[PDB]
Amino acid sequence: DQLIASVVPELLPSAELYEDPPGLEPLPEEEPLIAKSVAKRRNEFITVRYCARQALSVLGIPEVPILKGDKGQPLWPDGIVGSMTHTEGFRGAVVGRTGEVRSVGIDAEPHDVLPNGVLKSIALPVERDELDALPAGTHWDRLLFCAKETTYKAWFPLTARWLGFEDAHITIDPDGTFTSRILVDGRANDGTVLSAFDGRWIIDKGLILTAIVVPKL
Ligand SMILES: CCNC(=N)NC(=O)Nc1c(CC)cccc1CC
Ligand SMILES: [Mn+2]
Ligand SMILES: [Mn+2]
């Protein structure tokens, strides 16, 4: 019944918590990253890393700090890829080994309409027309935004480059899948070319969860 486990393969352990349990602490090496942060930010940072460390233990990796790189990206141990996300009512993480998968991204959002003006900032004109044609009963605008965030999180670890909202065209299928088509240069750091990603999505517990796994070559 866990949301991340429903949209990623069994080979990628995941862990999620819906509240901030009492008594958690960051590892000493992580404390400087949130020393001057408000309580809401300290709590999501600490709880998501407790989830990541649980998933890393399933891979046989013991307790390790998860620091942030120059573009805010989490810095995983050698031979590990992963992703983390937090929203009100959700903290989650997923990790995998580089010999099984190339990259993973996840994102969680509340299942509600986007705030005013956000859809115009994140969607291509063609995506807006596509969302209007989808069946009634799902907040397609919020699902599109969620899928764009997951696209960036799967892309950045492979390219080390920015990806704007206008740089990817996402097509959502009501069956719980989506595709992301990259509209800019897709040269990856390993010499290969990224052009498209396949994603999965689920709506449950008032939340939307999207995931992309970039598979082994
Ligand atoms: C496909 C285009 N999507 C993105 N480029 N998305 C992000 O940059 N998202 C983001 C933002 C901007 C909303 C701020 C802080 C941290 C992150 C990284 C998860
Ligand atoms: Mn967050
Ligand atoms: Mn997010």
Residue numbers in the entry: 5 to 221
Task: Give sentences copied directly from the paper behind this entry.
Despite the absence of inhibition on M. abscessus growth, and since 8918 was able to inhibit ACP conversion in our in vitro assay, we wanted to confirm binding to PptAb using X-ray crystallography. Crystals of PptAb prepared in the presence of CoA and Mn2+ were soaked in a 5 mM solution of 8918 and the structure of the complex was solved at 1.40 Å. Three hydrogen bonds involving the catalytic base Glu153, one hydrogen bond formed with the main chain oxygen atom of Leu167, and van der Waals contacts established with Lys152, Tyr156, Lys157, Trp166, Gly168, Phe169, and CoA are found. It is noteworthy that a second 8918 molecule was found at the surface of PptT11, which is not the case for PptAb. We found that 8918 inhibits ACP conversion by PptAb at nM concentrations and that total inhibition was achieved in the µM range. Indeed, unlike M. tuberculosis for which the MIC90 of compound 8918 varies from 0.56 to 3 μM on clinical isolates, it has no impact on the growth of M. abscessus in broth culture at concentrations up to 128.0 μM, probably as a result of its inability to penetrate the cell envelope.
Phosphopantetheinyl transferases (PPTases) are essential enzymes involved in primary and secondary metabolite biosynthetic pathways. They catalyze the transfer of the 4ʹ‐phosphopantetheinyl (Ppant) moiety of coenzyme A (CoA) to a strictly conserved serine residue of carrier protein (CP) domains present in fatty acid synthases (FASs), polyketide synthases (PKSs) and non-ribosomal peptide synthetases (NRPSs). The covalent attachment of the 20 Å-long Ppant arm to CP domains allows tethering substrates and chemical intermediates through a reactive thioester bond and transferring them to the different catalytic centers of the synthases where enzymatic modifications can proceed. Owing to their role in activating enzymes essential for bacterial viability and pathogenicity, phosphopantetheinyl transferases represent novel and attractive drug targets.
